[PDB]
Design a protein around this ligand. Sequence first.
Ligand SMILES: [Cl-]
Ligand SMILES: [Cl-]
Ligand SMILES: [Cl-]
Ligand SMILES: [K+]
Ligand SMILES: [Mg+2]
Ligand SMILES: [Mg+2]
Ligand SMILES: [Mg+2]
Ligand SMILES: [Mg+2]
Ligand SMILES: [Mg+2]
Ligand SMILES: [Mg+2]
Ligand SMILES: [Mg+2]
Ligand SMILES: [Mg+2]
Ligand SMILES: [Mg+2]
Ligand SMILES: [Mg+2]
Ligand SMILES: [Mg+2]
Ligand SMILES: [Mg+2]
Ligand SMILES: [Mg+2]
Ligand SMILES: [Mg+2]
Ligand SMILES: [Mg+2]
Ligand SMILES: [Mg+2]
Ligand SMILES: [Mg+2]
Ligand SMILES: [Mg+2]
Ligand code: NA
Ligand code: NA
Ligand code: NA
Ligand code: NA
Ligand code: NA
Ligand code: NA
Ligand code: NA
Ligand code: NA
Ligand code: NA
Ligand code: NA
Ligand code: NA
Ligand SMILES: [Sr+2]
Ligand SMILES: [Sr+2]
Ligand SMILES: [Sr+2]
Ligand SMILES: [Sr+2]
Ligand SMILES: [Sr+2]
Ligand SMILES: [Sr+2]
Ligand SMILES: [Sr+2]
Ligand SMILES: [Sr+2]
Ligand SMILES: [Sr+2]
Ligand SMILES: [Sr+2]
Lengths: 194, 46, 237, 119
Amino acid sequence: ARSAYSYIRDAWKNPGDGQLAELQWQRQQEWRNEGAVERIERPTRLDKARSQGYKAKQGVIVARVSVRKGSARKRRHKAGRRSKRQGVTRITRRKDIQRVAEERASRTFPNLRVLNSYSVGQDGRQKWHEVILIDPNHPAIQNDDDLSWICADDQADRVFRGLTGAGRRNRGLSGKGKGSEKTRPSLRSNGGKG
Amino acid sequence: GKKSKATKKRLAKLDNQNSRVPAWVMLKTDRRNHKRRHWRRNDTDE
Amino acid sequence: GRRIQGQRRGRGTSTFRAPSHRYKADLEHRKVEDGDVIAGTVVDIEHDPARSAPVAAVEFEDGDRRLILAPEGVGVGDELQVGVSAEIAPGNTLPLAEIPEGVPVCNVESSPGDGGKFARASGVNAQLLTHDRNVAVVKLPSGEMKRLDPQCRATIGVVAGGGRTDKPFVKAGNKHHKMKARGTKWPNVRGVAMNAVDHPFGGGGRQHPGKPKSISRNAPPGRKVGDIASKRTGRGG
Amino acid sequence: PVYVDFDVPADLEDDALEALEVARDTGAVKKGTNETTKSIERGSAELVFVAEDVQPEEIVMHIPELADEKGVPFIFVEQQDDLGHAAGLEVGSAAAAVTDAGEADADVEDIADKVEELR
RNA sequence: CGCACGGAGGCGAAGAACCACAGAUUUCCGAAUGAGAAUCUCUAACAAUUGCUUCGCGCAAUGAGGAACCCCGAGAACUGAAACAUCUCAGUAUCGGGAGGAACAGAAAACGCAACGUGAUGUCGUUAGUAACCGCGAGUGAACGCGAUACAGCCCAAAC
RNA sequence: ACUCGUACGGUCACUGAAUCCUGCCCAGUGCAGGUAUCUGAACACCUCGUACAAGAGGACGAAGGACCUGUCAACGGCGGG
RNA sequence: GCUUUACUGCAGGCUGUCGCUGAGGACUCUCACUCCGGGAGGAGGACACCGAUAGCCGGGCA
Ligand SMILES: [Cl-]
Ligand SMILES: [Cl-]
Ligand SMILES: [Cl-]
Ligand SMILES: [K+]
Ligand SMILES: [Mg+2]
Ligand SMILES: [Mg+2]
Ligand SMILES: [Mg+2]
Ligand SMILES: [Mg+2]
Ligand SMILES: [Mg+2]
Ligand SMILES: [Mg+2]
Ligand SMILES: [Mg+2]
Ligand SMILES: [Mg+2]
Ligand SMILES: [Mg+2]
Ligand SMILES: [Mg+2]
Ligand SMILES: [Mg+2]
Ligand SMILES: [Mg+2]
Ligand SMILES: [Mg+2]
Ligand SMILES: [Mg+2]
Ligand SMILES: [Mg+2]
Ligand SMILES: [Mg+2]
Ligand SMILES: [Mg+2]
Ligand SMILES: [Mg+2]
Ligand code: NA
Ligand code: NA
Ligand code: NA
Ligand code: NA
Ligand code: NA
Ligand code: NA
Ligand code: NA
Ligand code: NA
Ligand code: NA
Ligand code: NA
Ligand code: NA
Ligand SMILES: [Sr+2]
Ligand SMILES: [Sr+2]
Ligand SMILES: [Sr+2]
Ligand SMILES: [Sr+2]
Ligand SMILES: [Sr+2]
Ligand SMILES: [Sr+2]
Ligand SMILES: [Sr+2]
Ligand SMILES: [Sr+2]
Ligand SMILES: [Sr+2]
Ligand SMILES: [Sr+2]
C-alpha cells in the first residue's frame, strides 16, 4: 500500500494547491523574518530528505537557506569593452540558485559536508532550499554503512568542487551520450566549453 | 623619534653586523664584509 | 568624460558631508503614552548650528533634559506642555485635532508620532485650516494644502529666528562661515566655465551652454544639469 | 492547525489517551505515522490518533481526509509526547492507531460517537 | 672539534668523528586562536564558526602552506579579419573558492557502422580538418566506431 | 551622502557689487501641459494554420510620437526688398 | 582626449505586462507586502517594492 511519505510527495507536486498553499502562505511569513542560513530540527519534505540520503541520526543536520531571485548582480564595465561584452541586465550566473544555497550553508557549518538539497518554495523575490549536511567526524556516521563514504579525505569541500548532485547536474553531467562531449570528465579538462 | 623595545633590539643587531671579519678568519680561510652599512650613506629598515 | 560634481556628491565624502559631530540635537517631539501628564520648564535658549535659529533647553517632570525646536516668544522659566489635553498656548505640542483652526503651527508631523517634519526653518509657519474626524488640512509655508491625519502632533507658534533672509551676506567671508556649518560644497564654479570633459555645459571658445538648458526628467545622472524638467523659464510672458 | 477542523476538549482527550494505554496491553496498536497510514488503507483501523503540535504539518496533513474517505474515525491530541507515552514509547509519536482494541471496545465506541457529535 | 687551512684549548679505546632510524629539547612572531601590538605587552583563554553533548569548550571539526598538476566559479584587451561591429585572440590572461597524491569521471532514461549489433569511466592512436559553425568572410571544429592501456562492480529511497 | 536637515530649506543651473535699465520673436530645437482623432511593443484574447508547434492576421492600446498650448533672466534670432 | 541630430551598442529614467498576489471597465475589502508607532496600534494595500520582459527616451558611458 501507499506510504505516508508518498502523501508528502504528492502534496509537493503542486505547492500552490490545497492545504500546502495555506501552509506556505503562513510559513514564508516567518521565513522572511528568519536569517540567511537557519538550522531546522526536522525537514519540511521528509520524503525527499530520506530519498536524498537523510536519516534521523546523530550528525545528520538540515538547514534552510534563502537566496535572491533573478540574474547576476553585475557591475558595468569601468574600462573599454566591445559591444558583446558591454552587458549588465541580461547576464546570468553559470551556477544555479540551489548551488549558491548549498555553498552558503556549507560555509556556515565549516565542519560538516553537504549531502544534498531540495527546494522548499519561493515568493516574489527569493528562493528557499533545505540542505542536508553530515558530520564526517561523528562515530554515528563513521560506522553507518549507508553514509560512511562522506568521511573520506577526498570528500572534503565537496560542494565547492561541484561534487553534489545539484553540482553534477549543473555541470552538464546528466546525459551519458550525445550532448555531453564538452562536459565529461570535467569542464576544466574540456577547456571550459560547457 | 621614540623607539620601542623590539626596534631597539633590531638596531642593536644591525650595529653588531656592522663589524669587520676578524683577523683570525683571514688566516683560517687563507683569505671582506659585504653587509657594511654606514649611518649616512646607507639606509636601515623601518 | 569625468563624473560631474553632482555625482561626486552622492559618494558622501568628507568635503560633501555635514559636520554632524558639531551638531547639538535631533529636534524631535517627546513620546507620551496618553493622558497628557507631561510638562516642563525651559532652562535655557541655545543656538542650533544646524539651522541658524534658537533652540530651547527644556527639563521635564520625569528628569528628562532635551532640546526642543523653539517657536517665537518662548523664554526661560516658561512652562510648556506636551500631549492631548495641553493648553492652546505658544510652545505647547498637541495633535492637530485638539488645536483650533486659524492658529499658526510649526514642527508638523507627516505620519503621527514621527517627531516633526514640516515647518521647521527660521520664522516659517504652517496654517491649520479644515477639521474633520479623518482629515486636517494644513497649509505648508510653500503654499501647499497638505491633507493630514488629525493625530499628527504640532507645536504652536511660528518658528523662531524670523527674518534671517532679510540681511544680505554682503561679503563672501560671511557665506564661507555659514557654509562651513552645513553639508554643501562652496564656492560654485559654473559649468559653463569648465572643460567639456568636466560638465555638459563645458567647452567652447566663449562661455555659453552647448545645448538648451532645460533637461528631461528621464535624463541620466551625469547629464541632468541646468533647468531640470522646467514647466517654463524666464520672468516675462 | 491546517488539518485541525475541530477542537477536542481536555476531558475527551483524557478518555482517549486512557483507552490507548489499555489497548496496548490487551489488543494491538500501531505507533508512528507510516503504520497509521497503512492501517487506514488496509482497513484494519478502528480509531486513529493524531497530534496537533506536528512540525512540519505535511507528515500528518493527509489523515483527516484519508479517514473520511475510508469510514475510519479519528481524534486529536494536543501534545506529541503524551501520545508517544500512551502508545508505550519513551519517544513521542505524531500519530498512532488502534488496530483491534480490547477491554476498551466499549469506550472507543463511545469516543468515536462523541467526536461525530462534535463534527 | 661545519663552511674555514688561525691562536689557545678540548674530545675520542668508557669506541669519538661520521652515517641510518627513533626519541629529547625546540625562545618570539607567524592560520595565530585570551586581549592588544611593526616580532613586544596586558589580566586564565580552542578567538571565530560549527557538530556531539555529562549543555562544562567536556569530546571533536574548520582556518594556513605547498613546484606545478586537479576541480568549481568570475572573465579581458592588444591581436587576426590587412578598417571594423558578429566572428577571432579565448573561455586565453588575470581574479574568487577548494581537494588529493593524484584529481575529475564512472556502471546507460547509453550508443544508433539500424543490427540476429556494442555494452561503466577516463586516457593514448585514429576517425578528421571529416560532420557542424561562420559579415557562409577570415576563420572555427566535434562525435559514434575502431586499435590500444587498464579493467570491477556495487549502495540507498519505497513496497513488506 | 544630502540629513542631529524640512521651502526664511537645498538641490540644479545662468548672470556677476552698486546706479539707470533689461525691447521684439515660441517658426526650428529643448523642456513642459493637454489631446477628438491618428501612430504606438509585448503578455492575455479572437481568426487562419499545424491531430500540437513554428507562422500569418485581427481586436485592445501604455509611455512616446503626430496635432494643440505654455515657456527666451531656454538654446538661440532680431534681414533682403 | 573631446564633440555631435556619424555607425553600433551599453547603463539610467519613464511605461505596459507576468510573478509575489488575496476576499467581494469602473469599484469595495483585508490577509500577503510596505511604511509610522516603544507598544497597543495607525496609514497604505494587492498597489508599491523586488524579480522577468516589452516599447520610448537615452554621448551619461563603451
Ligand atoms: Cl561540502
Ligand atoms: Cl545659504
Ligand atoms: Cl557498436
Ligand atoms: K575585439
Ligand atoms: Mg581529466
Ligand atoms: Mg660599535
Ligand atoms: Mg530633528
Ligand atoms: Mg539667495
Ligand atoms: Mg563642508
Ligand atoms: Mg559661480
Ligand atoms: Mg577654461
Ligand atoms: Mg560629455
Ligand atoms: Mg559670458
Ligand atoms: Mg553666457
Ligand atoms: Mg594570541
Ligand atoms: Mg584587424
Ligand atoms: Mg572582409
Ligand atoms: Mg571556438
Ligand atoms: Mg555520437
Ligand atoms: Mg566673470
Ligand atoms: Mg524603518
Ligand atoms: Mg564615443
Ligand atoms: Na564545510
Ligand atoms: Na556549451
Ligand atoms: Na640613513
Ligand atoms: Na626541530
Ligand atoms: Na581546534
Ligand atoms: Na561547550
Ligand atoms: Na590589419
Ligand atoms: Na584602426
Ligand atoms: Na561569425
Ligand atoms: Na520657438
Ligand atoms: Na545677436
Ligand atoms: Sr577543508
Ligand atoms: Sr641619505
Ligand atoms: Sr524615529
Ligand atoms: Sr525625523
Ligand atoms: Sr559649451
Ligand atoms: Sr515679456
Ligand atoms: Sr521526536
Ligand atoms: Sr677545510
Ligand atoms: Sr569490461
Ligand atoms: Sr517651441
